[PDB]
């Protein structure tokens, strides 16, 4: 539905700014939700869907990141 914008730390060590998570060892450079293997599509104003149950709950910032990130490679 009209899922609300994800909070920083909604779940899974998520950040709204990918760069915030530089502190997180698994935050490799330039990993963004937009380039996550579990990305859905962009919905509005730099937010889009993350296609996992404990995630799609909220609309994630395309520029965000989380621990469940897997590279689309
Ligand atoms: S799995 Fe994480 S990094 Fe990937 S799109 Fe979802 S919230 Fe973003």
Where are the chain's structural domains? 1-73
Among 29, 39, 47, which residue has the most ligand 1 atoms within 8 Å of its CB, making it the best to mutate?
Answer: 39
Technique employed here was NMR
For the stretch 46-62, what's the b/e string if a residue is b when 16 or more beta carbons lie within 10 angstroms of its beta carbon? ebbbbeeeebeebbbbb
Task: Find out whether the beta carbon of 38 lies less than 6 Å from any atom of ligand 1.
Answer: yes
Sheet bearing 47-50, strands edge to edge = 39-44, 47-50, 60-61
Q: What is the DSSP string of 29-55?
A: TT--GGGBTTEEEEEETTEEEE-SHHH
Among residues 10, 2, 3, the alpha carbon closest in space to that of 54 is found at: 10
- CB-based contacts of 27, cutoff 8 Å, min separation 6: 18, 21, 65
Task: Find out whether the beta carbon of 47 lies less than 6 Å from any atom of ligand 1.
Answer: no
CA distance linking residue 61 with residue 50, whole number of Å: 9
**In the CATH scheme, what is the code of domain 1-73?**
4.10.490.10
């Amino acid at each position: 539905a009209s899922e609300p914008r994800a909070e920083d730390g909604h779940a899974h060590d998520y950040v709204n700014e990918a760069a915030d998570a530089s502190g997180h060892p698994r935050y490799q450079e330039g990993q963004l939700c937009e380039n996550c293997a579990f990305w859905g599509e962009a919905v509005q104003d730099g937010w889009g869907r993350c296609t996992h149950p404990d995630f799609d709950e909220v609309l994630v910032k395309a520029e965000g990141w989380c621990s469940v990130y897997a590279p689309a490679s």
